[PDB]
């Protein structure tokens, strides 16, 4: 399933959950 509508998939920065706080269209924690 999609972790966030900003990251693709299998994002290590979203593997242990969702450490993405940046945004939805563009973040800066999974650049």
To the question of whether residue 4 is assigned a binding role by annotation, the answer is yes
To the question of whether residue 31 is assigned a binding role by annotation, the answer is no
CB of residue 10 to Cd ion, shortest distance in Å = 9
Q: Which residues bind Cd ion (CB under 5 A)?
A: 3-4, 6-7, 11, 13-14, 18, 20, 22, 27, 29-30
CB of residue 18 to Cd ion, shortest distance in Å = 3
Q: Maximum distance among all alpha carbons in the chain?
A: 21
Cα 29 to Cα 16: distance, rounded to the nearest angstrom: 14
The nearer residue to Cd ion, 1 or 13, going by C-beta atoms, is 13
Q: How far is CA 13 from CA 1, 7, 18, 24, in A?
A: 15, 9, 7, 14
């Amino acid at each position: 399933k999609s972790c966030c509508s900003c990251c693709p998939v299998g994002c290590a920065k979203c593997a242990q959950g969702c450490i993405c706080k940046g945004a939805s269209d563009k973040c800066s924690c999974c650049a």
